[PDB]
Amino acid sequence: MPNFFIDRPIFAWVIAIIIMLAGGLAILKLPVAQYPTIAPPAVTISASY
Amino acid sequence: ERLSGNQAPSLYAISLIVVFLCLAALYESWSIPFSVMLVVPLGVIGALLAATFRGLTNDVYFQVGLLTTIGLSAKNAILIVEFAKDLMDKEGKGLIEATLDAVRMALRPILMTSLAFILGVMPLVISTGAGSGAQNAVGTGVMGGMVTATVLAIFFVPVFFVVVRRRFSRKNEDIEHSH
Amino acid sequence: HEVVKTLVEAIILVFLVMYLFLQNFRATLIPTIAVPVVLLGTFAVLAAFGFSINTLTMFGMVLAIGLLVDDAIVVVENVERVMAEEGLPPKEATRKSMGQIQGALVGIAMVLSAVFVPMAFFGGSTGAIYRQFSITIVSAMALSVLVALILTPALCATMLKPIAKGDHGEGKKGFFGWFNRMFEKSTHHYTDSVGGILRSTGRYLVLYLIIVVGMAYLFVRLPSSFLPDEDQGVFMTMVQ
Ligand SMILES: CCCCCCCCCCCCO[C@@H]1O[C@H](CO)[C@@H](O[C@H]2O[C@H](CO)[C@@H](O)[C@H](O)[C@H]2O)[C@H](O)[C@H]1O
Ligand SMILES: CCCCCCCCCCCCO[C@@H]1O[C@H](CO)[C@@H](O[C@H]2O[C@H](CO)[C@@H](O)[C@H](O)[C@H]2O)[C@H](O)[C@H]1O
């Protein structure tokens, strides 16, 4: 594989480029937060008398 | 539709870009992919003309149909150029002259491919009865596109190759190597 | 079911055009076999992805056929005109032939899936429409390559008749032998047509840019919409 791409330098470039634009496009649509969900989920029951 | 409903352009542009990159990988060249990609309008013109003359619309069935045509028009053009390049590198033959040999060592397979597909989408275009609206729609786009894509490319793909090869140099070949 | 009917008719019509060019019955039976193996596999993939049998997935099946047929023919034809230009029996003729095209096969399919894969990523309510069409075609194209590496070589190795002698034969059938002979110098009347449009280049380029402007012109003129109304055999009348 290294020998393969030593002979085919632009093929190696397009793999790198395709990976890179996939990544660029990913950034445009990725959510942003301080944290992911890390708190355990809670449910509250409220009643009144 | 206030919910951002127009993404086709950028998606077609991304798709166009990845096609060029993939083609670059295939031929190990940055320039040669252009000779394959110039075939794209040759198929689009047919779809527009067909949809126009049958009063169809640019809708879902128009967009999926044209990618189909572009896919197969690409595939035709690719195996022309595939031959032309391999006749220049393996056989070592000159530019114009390896184009010719390349050109239709593949006509017969290209006319097989295309005409068999064209007569294959024909049940869609001549479809009457339930759902024929969608069948008629998706059918005339592909058919018109493929008909023009192949009759036109078979004269323009030979041109695309040679024009690109000259603008993007290598001033110590053309004419007759061996090795 | 009506789309199922045109899918079947499409196959039969592809078979008929297979047979018109490739005159040999066993040579056209090979691509003919490939088509339903790939398409049925594709349904099995749709299942794996939780998709449904619908108008777009069904249309994908029909539109995939051109792509599939090409993989099968490229193998058959390469094998044919390996035998038809040396003299190997079908078993070693296909081995040599597969040896030099299998890279191309895999390669070209990846290039071609790239014209569909990005559109697997539309967003919102319009999105599932093109996703299901795109995954169908790409699923099909993948299985097509799979079948071209597995079944098709096997069938060429066992269903094709040997040839030898620099052969493509003009004289031993009636109608079909004629067809070949026309196409022959039709091929040359075509070749120098190109040779004459190679010493050209100048304004054959200009014509292309006219097609392009004519293309962008025809484009914007065309109205746009989402999905067409269909006659569903029923309707409603409101009274207020
Ligand atoms: C070239 C080969 C590929 C092309 C063939 C693809 C055709 C696809 C269209 C099929 C549309 C789906 O239609 C589907 O048909 C089968 C068979 O009647 C039905 O199946 C029904 O009948 C069969 C027996 O006949 C039972 O096994 C099954 O329990 C029952 O549900 C499905 O309920 C229906 O949803
Ligand atoms: C790799 C080769 C590919 C190259 C192909 C390049 C040619 C371009 C292909 C066709 C262009 C796309 O066509 C585009 O479709 C979108 C998506 O439905 C339409 O978008 C419109 O469609 C419908 C109906 O109005 C609405 O749901 C949507 O909100 C609206 O914006 C655009 O009006 C049209 O411009």
Side-chain angles (χ1 to χ4, degrees), chain B residues 1 4-9 12 15-17 19 37 40 44 58-60 62-63 66-67 70, chain C residues 114-115 122 126 130 219 224-226:
Chain B
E1 74 168 70
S4 290
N6 188 24
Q7 323 138 66
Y12 282 102
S15 208
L16 209 86
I17 289 155
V19 165
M37 300 209 59
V40 173
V44 184
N58 193 336
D59 57 350
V60 158
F62 179 69
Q63 292 145 29
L66 244 197
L67 297 146
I70 293 175
Chain C
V115 331
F122 291 86
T126 171
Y130 305 84
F219 184 91
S224 56
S225 51
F226 185 59

PDB file of all heavy atoms in Angstrom, chain B residues 1 4-9 12 15-17 19 37 40 44 58-60 62-63 66-67 70, chain C residues 114-115 122 126 130 219 224-226, ligand 2:
ATOM      1  N   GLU B   1     -41.650  25.097   4.060  1.00  0.00           N
ATOM      2  CA  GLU B   1     -40.585  25.516   3.140  1.00  0.00           C
ATOM      3  C   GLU B   1     -39.792  26.746   3.644  1.00  0.00           C
ATOM      4  O   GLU B   1     -38.664  26.946   3.168  1.00  0.00           O
ATOM      5  CB  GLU B   1     -41.122  25.760   1.715  1.00  0.00           C
ATOM      6  CG  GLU B   1     -41.947  27.006   1.430  1.00  0.00           C
ATOM      7  CD  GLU B   1     -42.130  27.211  -0.080  1.00  0.00           C
ATOM      8  OE1 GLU B   1     -42.860  26.407  -0.701  1.00  0.00           O
ATOM      9  OE2 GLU B   1     -41.521  28.144  -0.650  1.00  0.00           O
ATOM     10  N   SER B   4     -35.782  26.182   5.445  1.00  0.00           N
ATOM     11  CA  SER B   4     -34.672  26.027   4.488  1.00  0.00           C
ATOM     12  C   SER B   4     -34.812  24.869   3.497  1.00  0.00           C
ATOM     13  O   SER B   4     -34.276  23.782   3.713  1.00  0.00           O
ATOM     14  CB  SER B   4     -33.348  25.876   5.246  1.00  0.00           C
ATOM     15  OG  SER B   4     -32.972  27.093   5.870  1.00  0.00           O
ATOM     16  N   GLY B   5     -35.525  25.115   2.405  1.00  0.00           N
ATOM     17  CA  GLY B   5     -35.756  24.088   1.411  1.00  0.00           C
ATOM     18  C   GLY B   5     -35.188  24.423   0.044  1.00  0.00           C
ATOM     19  O   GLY B   5     -35.940  24.664  -0.895  1.00  0.00           O
ATOM     20  N   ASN B   6     -33.863  24.457  -0.061  1.00  0.00           N
ATOM     21  CA  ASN B   6     -33.185  24.530  -1.356  1.00  0.00           C
ATOM     22  C   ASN B   6     -31.710  24.179  -1.214  1.00  0.00           C
ATOM     23  O   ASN B   6     -30.864  25.054  -1.025  1.00  0.00           O
ATOM     24  CB  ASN B   6     -33.325  25.913  -1.999  1.00  0.00           C
ATOM     25  CG  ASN B   6     -32.784  25.943  -3.420  1.00  0.00           C
ATOM     26  OD1 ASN B   6     -32.718  24.909  -4.090  1.00  0.00           O
ATOM     27  ND2 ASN B   6     -32.381  27.124  -3.884  1.00  0.00           N
ATOM     28  N   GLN B   7     -31.408  22.892  -1.317  1.00  0.00           N
ATOM     29  CA  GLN B   7     -30.063  22.408  -1.056  1.00  0.00           C
ATOM     30  C   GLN B   7     -29.440  21.785  -2.295  1.00  0.00           C
ATOM     31  O   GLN B   7     -28.235  21.546  -2.335  1.00  0.00           O
ATOM     32  CB  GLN B   7     -30.089  21.387   0.077  1.00  0.00           C
ATOM     33  CG  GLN B   7     -31.084  21.717   1.158  1.00  0.00           C
ATOM     34  CD  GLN B   7     -31.827  20.493   1.624  1.00  0.00           C
ATOM     35  OE1 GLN B   7     -31.235  19.586   2.212  1.00  0.00           O
ATOM     36  NE2 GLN B   7     -33.135  20.453   1.362  1.00  0.00           N
ATOM     37  N   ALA B   8     -30.270  21.522  -3.298  1.00  0.00           N
ATOM     38  CA  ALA B   8     -29.814  20.905  -4.536  1.00  0.00           C
ATOM     39  C   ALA B   8     -28.504  21.500  -5.086  1.00  0.00           C
ATOM     40  O   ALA B   8     -27.563  20.748  -5.331  1.00  0.00           O
ATOM     41  CB  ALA B   8     -30.913  20.975  -5.590  1.00  0.00           C
ATOM     42  N   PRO B   9     -28.417  22.841  -5.244  1.00  0.00           N
ATOM     43  CA  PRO B   9     -27.204  23.380  -5.875  1.00  0.00           C
ATOM     44  C   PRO B   9     -25.905  22.932  -5.206  1.00  0.00           C
ATOM     45  O   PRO B   9     -25.051  22.340  -5.868  1.00  0.00           O
ATOM     46  CB  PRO B   9     -27.373  24.897  -5.731  1.00  0.00           C
ATOM     47  CG  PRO B   9     -28.822  25.109  -5.586  1.00  0.00           C
ATOM     48  CD  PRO B   9     -29.335  23.923  -4.837  1.00  0.00           C
ATOM     49  N   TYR B  12     -25.296  19.236  -5.654  1.00  0.00           N
ATOM     50  CA  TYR B  12     -24.807  18.940  -6.999  1.00  0.00           C
ATOM     51  C   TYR B  12     -23.375  19.410  -7.172  1.00  0.00           C
ATOM     52  O   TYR B  12     -22.610  18.802  -7.915  1.00  0.00           O
ATOM     53  CB  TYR B  12     -25.686  19.587  -8.073  1.00  0.00           C
ATOM     54  CG  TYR B  12     -26.985  18.857  -8.334  1.00  0.00           C
ATOM     55  CD1 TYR B  12     -28.180  19.324  -7.807  1.00  0.00           C
ATOM     56  CD2 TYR B  12     -27.013  17.707  -9.110  1.00  0.00           C
ATOM     57  CE1 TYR B  12     -29.367  18.666  -8.033  1.00  0.00           C
ATOM     58  CE2 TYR B  12     -28.196  17.041  -9.351  1.00  0.00           C
ATOM     59  CZ  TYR B  12     -29.373  17.525  -8.807  1.00  0.00           C
ATOM     60  OH  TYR B  12     -30.564  16.873  -9.034  1.00  0.00           O
ATOM     61  N   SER B  15     -21.210  16.928  -5.245  1.00  0.00           N
ATOM     62  CA  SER B  15     -21.219  15.726  -6.060  1.00  0.00           C
ATOM     63  C   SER B  15     -20.289  15.881  -7.262  1.00  0.00           C
ATOM     64  O   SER B  15     -19.549  14.964  -7.609  1.00  0.00           O
ATOM     65  CB  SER B  15     -22.647  15.423  -6.517  1.00  0.00           C
ATOM     66  OG  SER B  15     -22.831  14.038  -6.740  1.00  0.00           O
ATOM     67  N   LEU B  16     -20.322  17.055  -7.885  1.00  0.00           N
ATOM     68  CA  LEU B  16     -19.470  17.345  -9.036  1.00  0.00           C
ATOM     69  C   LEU B  16     -18.006  17.324  -8.640  1.00  0.00           C
ATOM     70  O   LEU B  16     -17.150  16.825  -9.370  1.00  0.00           O
ATOM     71  CB  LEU B  16     -19.821  18.705  -9.622  1.00  0.00           C
ATOM     72  CG  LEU B  16     -19.588  18.889 -11.113  1.00  0.00           C
ATOM     73  CD1 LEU B  16     -20.804  18.397 -11.890  1.00  0.00           C
ATOM     74  CD2 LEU B  16     -19.271  20.342 -11.419  1.00  0.00           C
ATOM     75  N   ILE B  17     -17.728  17.880  -7.466  1.00  0.00           N
ATOM     76  CA  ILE B  17     -16.371  17.941  -6.944  1.00  0.00           C
ATOM     77  C   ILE B  17     -15.816  16.548  -6.643  1.00  0.00           C
ATOM     78  O   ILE B  17     -14.696  16.231  -7.050  1.00  0.00           O
ATOM     79  CB  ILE B  17     -16.313  18.818  -5.679  1.00  0.00           C
ATOM     80  CG1 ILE B  17     -16.502  20.288  -6.062  1.00  0.00           C
ATOM     81  CG2 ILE B  17     -14.988  18.644  -4.961  1.00  0.00           C
ATOM     82  CD1 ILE B  17     -17.048  21.132  -4.938  1.00  0.00           C
ATOM     83  N   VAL B  19     -16.795  13.706  -7.855  1.00  0.00           N
ATOM     84  CA  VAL B  19     -16.615  13.065  -9.162  1.00  0.00           C
ATOM     85  C   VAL B  19     -15.250  13.410  -9.779  1.00  0.00           C
ATOM     86  O   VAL B  19     -14.520  12.521 -10.230  1.00  0.00           O
ATOM     87  CB  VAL B  19     -17.743  13.459 -10.154  1.00  0.00           C
ATOM     88  CG1 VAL B  19     -17.369  13.097 -11.581  1.00  0.00           C
ATOM     89  CG2 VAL B  19     -19.055  12.794  -9.758  1.00  0.00           C
ATOM     90  N   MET B  37     -15.689  14.989 -17.607  1.00  0.00           N
ATOM     91  CA  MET B  37     -16.727  15.787 -16.959  1.00  0.00           C
ATOM     92  C   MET B  37     -17.431  16.767 -17.889  1.00  0.00           C
ATOM     93  O   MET B  37     -18.545  17.208 -17.605  1.00  0.00           O
ATOM     94  CB  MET B  37     -16.134  16.543 -15.780  1.00  0.00           C
ATOM     95  CG  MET B  37     -15.553  15.633 -14.729  1.00  0.00           C
ATOM     96  SD  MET B  37     -15.656  16.409 -13.131  1.00  0.00           S
ATOM     97  CE  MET B  37     -17.423  16.647 -13.010  1.00  0.00           C
ATOM     98  N   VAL B  40     -21.074  16.167 -19.110  1.00  0.00           N
ATOM     99  CA  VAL B  40     -22.255  16.390 -18.274  1.00  0.00           C
ATOM    100  C   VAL B  40     -23.337  17.259 -18.949  1.00  0.00           C
ATOM    101  O   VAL B  40     -24.503  16.847 -18.993  1.00  0.00           O
ATOM    102  CB  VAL B  40     -21.866  17.015 -16.894  1.00  0.00           C
ATOM    103  CG1 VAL B  40     -23.106  17.396 -16.094  1.00  0.00           C
ATOM    104  CG2 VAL B  40     -20.997  16.052 -16.099  1.00  0.00           C
ATOM    105  N   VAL B  44     -27.526  16.805 -19.867  1.00  0.00           N
ATOM    106  CA  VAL B  44     -28.485  17.697 -19.220  1.00  0.00           C
ATOM    107  C   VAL B  44     -29.376  18.392 -20.258  1.00  0.00           C
ATOM    108  O   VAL B  44     -30.576  18.568 -20.040  1.00  0.00           O
ATOM    109  CB  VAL B  44     -27.777  18.761 -18.348  1.00  0.00           C
ATOM    110  CG1 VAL B  44     -28.795  19.609 -17.613  1.00  0.00           C
ATOM    111  CG2 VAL B  44     -26.851  18.094 -17.355  1.00  0.00           C
ATOM    112  N   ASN B  58     -39.327  20.676 -13.285  1.00  0.00           N
ATOM    113  CA  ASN B  58     -38.120  20.316 -12.556  1.00  0.00           C
ATOM    114  C   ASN B  58     -38.506  19.858 -11.157  1.00  0.00           C
ATOM    115  O   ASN B  58     -38.556  20.659 -10.218  1.00  0.00           O
ATOM    116  CB  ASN B  58     -37.148  21.494 -12.487  1.00  0.00           C
ATOM    117  CG  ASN B  58     -35.763  21.086 -12.017  1.00  0.00           C
ATOM    118  OD1 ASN B  58     -35.590  20.078 -11.331  1.00  0.00           O
ATOM    119  ND2 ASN B  58     -34.764  21.874 -12.391  1.00  0.00           N
ATOM    120  N   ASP B  59     -38.790  18.567 -11.022  1.00  0.00           N
ATOM    121  CA  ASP B  59     -39.230  18.016  -9.741  1.00  0.00           C
ATOM    122  C   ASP B  59     -38.338  16.870  -9.286  1.00  0.00           C
ATOM    123  O   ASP B  59     -37.260  16.648  -9.844  1.00  0.00           O
ATOM    124  CB  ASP B  59     -40.689  17.543  -9.831  1.00  0.00           C
ATOM    125  CG  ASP B  59     -40.908  16.516 -10.931  1.00  0.00           C
ATOM    126  OD1 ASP B  59     -39.982  16.315 -11.750  1.00  0.00           O
ATOM    127  OD2 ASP B  59     -42.008  15.918 -10.982  1.00  0.00           O
ATOM    128  N   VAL B  60     -38.790  16.141  -8.272  1.00  0.00           N
ATOM    129  CA  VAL B  60     -38.025  15.011  -7.765  1.00  0.00           C
ATOM    130  C   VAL B  60     -37.682  14.022  -8.884  1.00  0.00           C
ATOM    131  O   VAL B  60     -36.529  13.604  -9.023  1.00  0.00           O
ATOM    132  CB  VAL B  60     -38.782  14.284  -6.655  1.00  0.00           C
ATOM    133  CG1 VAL B  60     -38.262  12.855  -6.512  1.00  0.00           C
ATOM    134  CG2 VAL B  60     -38.674  15.064  -5.335  1.00  0.00           C
ATOM    135  N   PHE B  62     -37.378  14.535 -11.858  1.00  0.00           N
ATOM    136  CA  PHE B  62     -36.516  15.147 -12.864  1.00  0.00           C
ATOM    137  C   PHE B  62     -35.068  15.142 -12.381  1.00  0.00           C
ATOM    138  O   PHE B  62     -34.138  15.004 -13.169  1.00  0.00           O
ATOM    139  CB  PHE B  62     -36.958  16.576 -13.191  1.00  0.00           C
ATOM    140  CG  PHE B  62     -36.077  17.258 -14.205  1.00  0.00           C
ATOM    141  CD1 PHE B  62     -36.064  16.837 -15.524  1.00  0.00           C
ATOM    142  CD2 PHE B  62     -35.253  18.304 -13.838  1.00  0.00           C
ATOM    143  CE1 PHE B  62     -35.249  17.452 -16.464  1.00  0.00           C
ATOM    144  CE2 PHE B  62     -34.437  18.918 -14.765  1.00  0.00           C
ATOM    145  CZ  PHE B  62     -34.436  18.493 -16.082  1.00  0.00           C
ATOM    146  N   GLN B  63     -34.887  15.282 -11.077  1.00  0.00           N
ATOM    147  CA  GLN B  63     -33.552  15.310 -10.504  1.00  0.00           C
ATOM    148  C   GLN B  63     -32.939  13.913 -10.364  1.00  0.00           C
ATOM    149  O   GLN B  63     -31.753  13.738 -10.638  1.00  0.00           O
ATOM    150  CB  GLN B  63     -33.590  16.022  -9.155  1.00  0.00           C
ATOM    151  CG  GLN B  63     -33.899  17.501  -9.281  1.00  0.00           C
ATOM    152  CD  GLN B  63     -34.737  18.009  -8.136  1.00  0.00           C
ATOM    153  OE1 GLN B  63     -34.672  17.485  -7.021  1.00  0.00           O
ATOM    154  NE2 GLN B  63     -35.555  19.021  -8.407  1.00  0.00           N
ATOM    155  N   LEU B  66     -31.813  12.641 -13.873  1.00  0.00           N
ATOM    156  CA  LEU B  66     -30.658  13.218 -14.530  1.00  0.00           C
ATOM    157  C   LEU B  66     -29.347  12.691 -13.958  1.00  0.00           C
ATOM    158  O   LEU B  66     -28.351  12.585 -14.679  1.00  0.00           O
ATOM    159  CB  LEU B  66     -30.698  14.741 -14.453  1.00  0.00           C
ATOM    160  CG  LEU B  66     -30.829  15.343 -15.857  1.00  0.00           C
ATOM    161  CD1 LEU B  66     -30.459  16.825 -15.860  1.00  0.00           C
ATOM    162  CD2 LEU B  66     -30.014  14.548 -16.904  1.00  0.00           C
ATOM    163  N   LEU B  67     -29.349  12.347 -12.676  1.00  0.00           N
ATOM    164  CA  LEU B  67     -28.176  11.733 -12.065  1.00  0.00           C
ATOM    165  C   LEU B  67     -27.918  10.358 -12.674  1.00  0.00           C
ATOM    166  O   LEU B  67     -26.772  10.002 -12.967  1.00  0.00           O
ATOM    167  CB  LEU B  67     -28.352  11.643 -10.553  1.00  0.00           C
ATOM    168  CG  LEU B  67     -28.461  13.042  -9.949  1.00  0.00           C
ATOM    169  CD1 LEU B  67     -29.378  13.031  -8.773  1.00  0.00           C
ATOM    170  CD2 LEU B  67     -27.099  13.571  -9.557  1.00  0.00           C
ATOM    171  N   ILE B  70     -26.412  11.166 -16.066  1.00  0.00           N
ATOM    172  CA  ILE B  70     -25.047  11.605 -15.807  1.00  0.00           C
ATOM    173  C   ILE B  70     -24.141  10.441 -15.391  1.00  0.00           C
ATOM    174  O   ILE B  70     -22.972  10.391 -15.770  1.00  0.00           O
ATOM    175  CB  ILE B  70     -25.009  12.692 -14.713  1.00  0.00           C
ATOM    176  CG1 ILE B  70     -25.682  13.962 -15.223  1.00  0.00           C
ATOM    177  CG2 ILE B  70     -23.571  13.002 -14.301  1.00  0.00           C
ATOM    178  CD1 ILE B  70     -25.809  15.041 -14.186  1.00  0.00           C
TER     179      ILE B  70
ATOM    180  N   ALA C 114     -20.060   8.074  -6.416  1.00  0.00           N
ATOM    181  CA  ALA C 114     -19.862   9.459  -6.010  1.00  0.00           C
ATOM    182  C   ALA C 114     -20.879  10.412  -6.634  1.00  0.00           C
ATOM    183  O   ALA C 114     -21.068  11.510  -6.129  1.00  0.00           O
ATOM    184  CB  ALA C 114     -18.439   9.920  -6.350  1.00  0.00           C
ATOM    185  N   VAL C 115     -21.536  10.024  -7.727  1.00  0.00           N
ATOM    186  CA  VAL C 115     -22.514  10.937  -8.314  1.00  0.00           C
ATOM    187  C   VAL C 115     -23.857  10.768  -7.595  1.00  0.00           C
ATOM    188  O   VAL C 115     -24.788  11.561  -7.803  1.00  0.00           O
ATOM    189  CB  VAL C 115     -22.682  10.744  -9.866  1.00  0.00           C
ATOM    190  CG1 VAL C 115     -21.389  10.237 -10.519  1.00  0.00           C
ATOM    191  CG2 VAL C 115     -23.853   9.850 -10.208  1.00  0.00           C
ATOM    192  N   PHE C 122     -29.590  14.653   1.721  1.00  0.00           N
ATOM    193  CA  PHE C 122     -30.571  15.746   1.792  1.00  0.00           C
ATOM    194  C   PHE C 122     -31.111  15.840   3.211  1.00  0.00           C
ATOM    195  O   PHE C 122     -31.036  14.880   3.977  1.00  0.00           O
ATOM    196  CB  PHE C 122     -31.741  15.555   0.819  1.00  0.00           C
ATOM    197  CG  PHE C 122     -31.372  15.699  -0.630  1.00  0.00           C
ATOM    198  CD1 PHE C 122     -30.894  14.618  -1.327  1.00  0.00           C
ATOM    199  CD2 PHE C 122     -31.477  16.913  -1.290  1.00  0.00           C
ATOM    200  CE1 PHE C 122     -30.547  14.722  -2.660  1.00  0.00           C
ATOM    201  CE2 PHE C 122     -31.127  17.018  -2.635  1.00  0.00           C
ATOM    202  CZ  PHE C 122     -30.655  15.917  -3.314  1.00  0.00           C
ATOM    203  N   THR C 126     -38.167  16.625   2.545  1.00  0.00           N
ATOM    204  CA  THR C 126     -37.830  16.270   1.174  1.00  0.00           C
ATOM    205  C   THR C 126     -36.732  15.205   1.153  1.00  0.00           C
ATOM    206  O   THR C 126     -36.558  14.493   0.165  1.00  0.00           O
ATOM    207  CB  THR C 126     -37.364  17.509   0.365  1.00  0.00           C
ATOM    208  OG1 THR C 126     -36.842  17.098  -0.905  1.00  0.00           O
ATOM    209  CG2 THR C 126     -36.275  18.272   1.119  1.00  0.00           C
ATOM    210  N   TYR C 130     -34.900  11.371  -1.693  1.00  0.00           N
ATOM    211  CA  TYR C 130     -33.695  11.197  -2.505  1.00  0.00           C
ATOM    212  C   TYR C 130     -32.723  10.238  -1.846  1.00  0.00           C
ATOM    213  O   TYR C 130     -31.867   9.662  -2.518  1.00  0.00           O
ATOM    214  CB  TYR C 130     -32.963  12.519  -2.740  1.00  0.00           C
ATOM    215  CG  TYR C 130     -33.753  13.659  -3.351  1.00  0.00           C
ATOM    216  CD1 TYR C 130     -34.531  14.493  -2.552  1.00  0.00           C
ATOM    217  CD2 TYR C 130     -33.677  13.935  -4.709  1.00  0.00           C
ATOM    218  CE1 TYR C 130     -35.240  15.542  -3.096  1.00  0.00           C
ATOM    219  CE2 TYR C 130     -34.380  14.987  -5.264  1.00  0.00           C
ATOM    220  CZ  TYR C 130     -35.161  15.787  -4.454  1.00  0.00           C
ATOM    221  OH  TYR C 130     -35.868  16.833  -5.002  1.00  0.00           O
ATOM    222  N   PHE C 219     -32.822  25.639 -18.595  1.00  0.00           N
ATOM    223  CA  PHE C 219     -32.939  25.297 -17.187  1.00  0.00           C
ATOM    224  C   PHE C 219     -33.833  26.285 -16.438  1.00  0.00           C
ATOM    225  O   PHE C 219     -34.875  25.900 -15.918  1.00  0.00           O
ATOM    226  CB  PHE C 219     -31.549  25.241 -16.549  1.00  0.00           C
ATOM    227  CG  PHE C 219     -31.552  24.799 -15.113  1.00  0.00           C
ATOM    228  CD1 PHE C 219     -31.418  23.456 -14.788  1.00  0.00           C
ATOM    229  CD2 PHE C 219     -31.681  25.727 -14.085  1.00  0.00           C
ATOM    230  CE1 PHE C 219     -31.415  23.046 -13.460  1.00  0.00           C
ATOM    231  CE2 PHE C 219     -31.685  25.326 -12.759  1.00  0.00           C
ATOM    232  CZ  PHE C 219     -31.551  23.984 -12.442  1.00  0.00           C
ATOM    233  N   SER C 224     -40.405  24.783 -11.352  1.00  0.00           N
ATOM    234  CA  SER C 224     -40.031  23.691 -10.471  1.00  0.00           C
ATOM    235  C   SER C 224     -41.176  23.351  -9.520  1.00  0.00           C
ATOM    236  O   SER C 224     -42.043  24.182  -9.247  1.00  0.00           O
ATOM    237  CB  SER C 224     -38.746  24.028  -9.697  1.00  0.00           C
ATOM    238  OG  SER C 224     -38.867  25.237  -8.969  1.00  0.00           O
ATOM    239  N   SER C 225     -41.185  22.107  -9.049  1.00  0.00           N
ATOM    240  CA  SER C 225     -42.168  21.639  -8.075  1.00  0.00           C
ATOM    241  C   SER C 225     -41.590  20.440  -7.327  1.00  0.00           C
ATOM    242  O   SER C 225     -40.463  20.021  -7.595  1.00  0.00           O
ATOM    243  CB  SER C 225     -43.492  21.279  -8.751  1.00  0.00           C
ATOM    244  OG  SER C 225     -43.280  20.397  -9.838  1.00  0.00           O
ATOM    245  N   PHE C 226     -42.349  19.890  -6.386  1.00  0.00           N
ATOM    246  CA  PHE C 226     -41.851  18.748  -5.634  1.00  0.00           C
ATOM    247  C   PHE C 226     -42.276  17.413  -6.256  1.00  0.00           C
ATOM    248  O   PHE C 226     -41.478  16.758  -6.925  1.00  0.00           O
ATOM    249  CB  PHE C 226     -42.305  18.822  -4.185  1.00  0.00           C
ATOM    250  CG  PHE C 226     -41.722  17.749  -3.323  1.00  0.00           C
ATOM    251  CD1 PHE C 226     -40.347  17.633  -3.180  1.00  0.00           C
ATOM    252  CD2 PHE C 226     -42.540  16.856  -2.658  1.00  0.00           C
ATOM    253  CE1 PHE C 226     -39.800  16.642  -2.388  1.00  0.00           C
ATOM    254  CE2 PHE C 226     -41.999  15.868  -1.858  1.00  0.00           C
ATOM    255  CZ  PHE C 226     -40.627  15.757  -1.725  1.00  0.00           C
TER     256      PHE C 226
HETATM  257  C1  LIG D   2     -22.268  15.204 -10.768  1.00  0.00           C
HETATM  258  C2  LIG D   2     -23.152  15.733 -11.877  1.00  0.00           C
HETATM  259  C3  LIG D   2     -24.329  16.535 -11.329  1.00  0.00           C
HETATM  260  C4  LIG D   2     -24.467  17.862 -12.073  1.00  0.00           C
HETATM  261  C5  LIG D   2     -25.922  18.296 -12.234  1.00  0.00           C
HETATM  262  C6  LIG D   2     -26.058  19.817 -12.244  1.00  0.00           C
HETATM  263  C7  LIG D   2     -27.413  20.264 -12.788  1.00  0.00           C
HETATM  264  C8  LIG D   2     -28.406  20.637 -11.687  1.00  0.00           C
HETATM  265  C9  LIG D   2     -29.420  19.526 -11.426  1.00  0.00           C
HETATM  266  C10 LIG D   2     -30.839  20.048 -11.196  1.00  0.00           C
HETATM  267  C11 LIG D   2     -30.863  21.305 -10.335  1.00  0.00           C
HETATM  268  C12 LIG D   2     -31.690  21.130  -9.066  1.00  0.00           C
HETATM  269  O1  LIG D   2     -32.994  21.702  -9.183  1.00  0.00           O
HETATM  270  C13 LIG D   2     -33.410  22.291  -7.944  1.00  0.00           C
HETATM  271  O2  LIG D   2     -34.268  21.393  -7.239  1.00  0.00           O
HETATM  272  C14 LIG D   2     -34.609  21.931  -5.963  1.00  0.00           C
HETATM  273  C15 LIG D   2     -35.042  20.852  -4.965  1.00  0.00           C
HETATM  274  O3  LIG D   2     -36.354  20.350  -5.262  1.00  0.00           O
HETATM  275  C16 LIG D   2     -35.663  22.997  -6.219  1.00  0.00           C
HETATM  276  O4  LIG D   2     -36.150  23.472  -4.962  1.00  0.00           O
HETATM  277  C17 LIG D   2     -37.551  23.771  -4.959  1.00  0.00           C
HETATM  278  O5  LIG D   2     -38.281  22.535  -5.056  1.00  0.00           O
HETATM  279  C18 LIG D   2     -39.570  22.396  -4.425  1.00  0.00           C
HETATM  280  C19 LIG D   2     -40.692  23.029  -5.257  1.00  0.00           C
HETATM  281  O6  LIG D   2     -40.586  24.456  -5.350  1.00  0.00           O
HETATM  282  C20 LIG D   2     -39.599  22.901  -2.984  1.00  0.00           C
HETATM  283  O7  LIG D   2     -39.818  21.780  -2.118  1.00  0.00           O
HETATM  284  C21 LIG D   2     -38.300  23.588  -2.593  1.00  0.00           C
HETATM  285  O8  LIG D   2     -38.476  24.274  -1.343  1.00  0.00           O
HETATM  286  C22 LIG D   2     -37.875  24.556  -3.692  1.00  0.00           C
HETATM  287  O9  LIG D   2     -36.734  25.333  -3.297  1.00  0.00           O
HETATM  288  C23 LIG D   2     -35.018  24.112  -7.044  1.00  0.00           C
HETATM  289  O10 LIG D   2     -36.058  24.941  -7.580  1.00  0.00           O
HETATM  290  C24 LIG D   2     -34.151  23.609  -8.210  1.00  0.00           C
HETATM  291  O11 LIG D   2     -33.204  24.628  -8.570  1.00  0.00           O
END
